[PDB]
Amino acid sequence: ADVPAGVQLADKQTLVRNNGSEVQSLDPHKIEGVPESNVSRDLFEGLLISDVEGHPSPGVAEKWENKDFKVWTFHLRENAKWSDGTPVTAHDFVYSWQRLADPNTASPYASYLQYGHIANIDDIIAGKKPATDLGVKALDDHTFEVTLSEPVPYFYKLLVHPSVSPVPKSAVEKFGDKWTQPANIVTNGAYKLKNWVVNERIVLERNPQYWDNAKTVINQVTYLPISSEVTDVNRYRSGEIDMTYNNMPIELFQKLKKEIPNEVRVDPYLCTYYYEINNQKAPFNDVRVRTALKLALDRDIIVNKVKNQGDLPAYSYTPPYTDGAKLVEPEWFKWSQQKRNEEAKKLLAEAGFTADKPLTFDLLYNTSDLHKKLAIAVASIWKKNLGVNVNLENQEWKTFLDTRHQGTFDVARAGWCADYNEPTSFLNTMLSDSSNNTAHYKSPAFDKLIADTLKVADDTQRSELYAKAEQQLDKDSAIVPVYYYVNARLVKPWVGGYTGKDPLDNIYVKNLYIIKH
């Protein structure tokens, strides 16, 4: 943390953050959500990290070079260490990126190595080549070299993501899936794991072997798993919680803006809220049904009337303000809701649905005050505007993600937040073979469009190809875009170092500090 001159620090440097839910795992190759990555950033550090404003900056790698955007060489700081005091080396990374690539690890983020185009990854994931053929090598203990199959000018931007963080092979090999227990785990970020009580708390303590330890200020941070946004706000205001999770309750937000305006942080965020349709399950495999659901939803009502917390009505998957996004707003989005509804009804009537045999399906969401209130409103709007019946169902976070990966669900409450600020952090996830493709969408036309983006060596042709990829997605009604999130949360006045300038919200507790209060 960089504590400004003249700030007085509290004697006790501890922090309590709400983290939305119980994490799927603390293993960097088994995780894919925000709550998981919030904890992962404090425990495991990759080649690069985001600075306090989000810019890609030195992580274990103090400096790097590239040749033709295809061969990337990372020079690892000599004092990078794990929590047991042993050196962090380039072989840790080799081992780690191979384990991510290996089908037997079954990482939800296996395809991140496809997104960076590391050599031989397609064959590895397909089981045609062993993981040991991946295009990574340790040239020595402090030098990690990555070879891509084509030029990727933004490659280093990917490397702050938890899936490319190192894992300690000895712990992994000796303890299997219990390697992340506190008595076994070994970590290289600013914190170590002190305690983990499922559905109660995760407590982290300063890791004194961290290379940048001298600048770390918070000695302990607790992450909680409260999925009720009302409860999170209540335990913030009672004094227990210093930073809520960044999901705000419909019940209390407007009041909060008026009672504690300086604690209510609202900043740009590269995330989209949408209803993920299971594209492979009838009747959702019919474009007519998907398009009707997409068009009959009334974004104005949801976004400005029922939520009203600053979100923007969405007509795409990639947020329009992603760096490199130059999206074309579909014509359906400028129609009146009235014209949207008629088109929707016409389409379902064409799909074989009638008053007598209406369309009925499930809307699956993760236990939450906010998502339940929004699902209820969506249900009513769909009932009213289109005559479809929806059954609401809530699932705890971890189970919910497994349900979507299993793909027999109907529709699910989804959100995707950028992992790197470039349109393919979103677009790559709808590739037919992406491990992140829970929409279960498979379009050869879509795949081609994206594959072509690295075949050109021009940003304009790339941006136009991302624009067309979003038009293919929309044409197919792969999803139901709802809104583009704003990052809204409560932060106590004594929490210093949280700028809100990072549109990916990659916070590191090593950058924060408690002001004397």
Side-chain angles (χ1 to χ4, degrees):
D2 295 325
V3 178
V7 344
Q8 268 198 82
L9 298 157
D11 274 7
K12 204 192 167 241
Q13 293 289 328
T14 56
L15 179 83
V16 173
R17 295 185 64 182
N18 191 45
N19 199 41
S21 41
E22 180 62 24
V23 293
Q24 288 168 292
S25 170
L26 302 177
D27 183 334
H29 300 149
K30 307 276 177 179
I31 57 164
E32 76 204 287
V34 173
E36 286 72 20
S37 307
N38 281 345
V39 180
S40 202
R41 290 187 297 282
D42 292 331
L43 295 181
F44 300 101
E45 179 177 76
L47 295 170
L48 277 66
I49 57 187
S50 288
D51 72 0
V52 277
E53 289 182 21
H55 316 110
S57 310
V60 178
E62 47 184 333
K63 71 204 85 285
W64 51 93
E65 304 77 50
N66 77 87
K67 171 55 52 223
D68 306 333
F69 311 113
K70 281 185 58 166
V71 182
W72 291 81
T73 306
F74 295 98
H75 307 283
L76 318 183
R77 68 189 54 260
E78 303 210 312
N79 65 340
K81 296 172 192 209
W82 288 99
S83 51
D84 59 7
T86 63
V88 177
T89 62
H91 316 279
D92 288 314
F93 286 89
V94 166
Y95 166 73
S96 293
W97 295 18
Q98 289 167 348
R99 181 169 182 261
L100 174 63
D102 186 343
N104 296 329
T105 315
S107 181
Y109 263 100
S111 304
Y112 203 63
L113 299 172
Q114 302 168 305
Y115 309 160
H117 296 285
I118 292 78
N120 288 329
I121 178 66
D122 292 357
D123 276 348
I124 285 157
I125 288 165
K128 305 180 182 149
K129 299 187 180 94
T132 46
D133 284 12
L134 182 76
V136 297
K137 44 189 80 163
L139 302 181
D140 60 42
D141 282 354
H142 311 307
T143 312
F144 181 63
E145 184 198 77
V146 180
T147 294
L148 314 185
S149 66
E150 63 188 342
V152 184
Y154 52 89
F155 181 71
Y156 69 97
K157 291 178 38 170
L158 275 58
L159 312 174
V160 305
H161 192 268
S163 65
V164 286
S165 285
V167 309
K169 161 171 187 156
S170 65
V172 169
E173 257 162 23
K174 183 179 174 164
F175 300 103
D177 50 28
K178 285 184 152 192
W179 80 268
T180 59
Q181 282 309 106
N184 306 332
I185 201 191
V186 174
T187 60
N188 80 312
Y191 292 97
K192 323 185 215 174
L193 176 62
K194 190 188 182 187
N195 313 267
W196 185 357
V197 178
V198 175
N199 276 148
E200 222 148 61
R201 65 187 62 243
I202 287 164
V203 180
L204 311 189
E205 54 179 341
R206 178 199 283 279
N207 166 20
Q209 302 295 336
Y210 182 50
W211 65 271
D212 210 17
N213 192 56
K215 306 195 177 176
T216 291
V217 166
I218 298 292
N219 291 322
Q220 169 181 300
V221 53
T222 293
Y223 281 84
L224 304 170
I226 304 158
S227 59
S228 159
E229 298 88 2
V230 171
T231 307
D232 182 1
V233 166
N234 291 338
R235 298 184 181 172
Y236 170 92
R237 302 196 70 190
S238 84
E240 183 185 346
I241 301 184
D242 306 297
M243 292 170 91
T244 63
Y245 183 58
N246 54 347
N247 266 353
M248 290 290 85
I250 296 295
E251 289 91 334
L252 311 181
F253 193 70
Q254 305 315 313
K255 292 286 182 182
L256 299 168
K257 270 197 88 142
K258 300 302 148 220
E259 256 156 288
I260 53 174
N262 291 316
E263 293 178 41
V264 180
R265 314 293 211 92
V266 175
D267 293 285
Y269 199 17
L270 279 171
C271 307
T272 300
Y273 188 114
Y274 58 107
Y275 289 98
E276 168 187 87
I277 300 164
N278 174 4
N279 281 244
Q280 305 173 173
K281 145 112 165 211
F284 307 102
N285 59 338
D286 192 329
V287 70
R288 290 176 307 198
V289 173
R290 314 198 292 266
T291 302
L293 294 172
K294 181 180 82 184
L295 297 175
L297 193 151
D298 186 342
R299 305 164 172 72
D300 179 69
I301 290 176
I302 291 298
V303 190
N304 307 138
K305 324 258 105 91
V306 11
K307 194 160 177 272
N308 191 224
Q309 302 169 353
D311 310 291
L312 272 44
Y315 56 76
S316 70
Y317 182 41
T318 303
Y321 37 114
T322 303
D323 185 340
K326 291 157 165 284
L327 312 193
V328 177
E329 181 170 300
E331 280 298 304
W332 70 251
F333 186 76
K334 336 138 99 148
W335 297 345
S336 55
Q337 187 55 42
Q338 179 246 97
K339 178 182 188 168
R340 273 188 303 276
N341 293 343
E342 273 302 279
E343 176 69 26
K345 293 177 298 195
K346 169 180 153 170
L347 288 166
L348 281 191
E350 297 179 359
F353 294 97
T354 68
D356 192 24
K357 344 242 292 171
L359 167 55
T360 295
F361 63 80
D362 312 308
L363 191 174
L364 174 64
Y365 69 92
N366 57 301
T367 306
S368 161
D369 271 288
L370 175 67
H371 304 307
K372 180 192 334 199
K373 287 195 150 34
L374 310 168
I376 291 173
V378 163
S380 173
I381 290 173
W382 275 337
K383 177 65 181 196
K384 182 199 193 18
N385 286 7
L386 179 65
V388 304
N389 305 309
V390 322
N391 296 305
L392 263 45
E393 293 173 1
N394 66 288
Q395 273 182 180
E396 280 328 290
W397 183 244
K398 188 185 202 163
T399 300
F400 176 59
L401 304 190
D402 289 341
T403 296
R404 286 167 66 196
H405 285 290
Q406 297 161 181
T408 44
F409 62 102
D410 297 322
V411 177
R413 184 246 117 198
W416 184 259
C417 290
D419 299 317
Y420 56 98
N421 193 354
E422 205 279 347
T424 59
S425 186
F426 278 72
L427 291 167
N428 283 347
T429 67
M430 298 283 192
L431 290 171
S432 303
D433 60 342
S434 170
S435 57
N436 299 116
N437 196 328
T438 40
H440 296 272
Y441 169 77
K442 294 182 177 65
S443 175
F446 180 87
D447 292 348
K448 170 69 133 45
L449 290 173
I450 301 314
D452 284 347
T453 72
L454 295 170
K455 278 50 166 195
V456 296
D458 156 324
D459 273 348
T460 305
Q461 277 150 53
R462 253 171 225 128
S463 282
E464 283 173 338
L465 286 163
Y466 297 147
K468 300 166 192 31
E470 281 287 339
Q471 291 171 315
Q472 182 60 52
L473 209 62
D474 181 58
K475 178 171 317 137
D476 293 330
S477 287
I479 63 165
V480 185
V482 179
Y483 58 79
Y484 306 117
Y485 292 63
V486 283
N487 183 3
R489 54 152 55 86
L490 308 186
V491 177
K492 298 288 168 77
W494 51 84
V495 177
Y498 179 74
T499 78
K501 294 289 250 308
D502 176 11
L504 305 198
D505 205 35
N506 279 318
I507 301 321
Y508 295 84
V509 172
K510 75 188 176 65
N511 291 330
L512 304 179
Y513 56 91
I514 306 307
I515 294 166
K516 201 193 273 169
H517 64 280

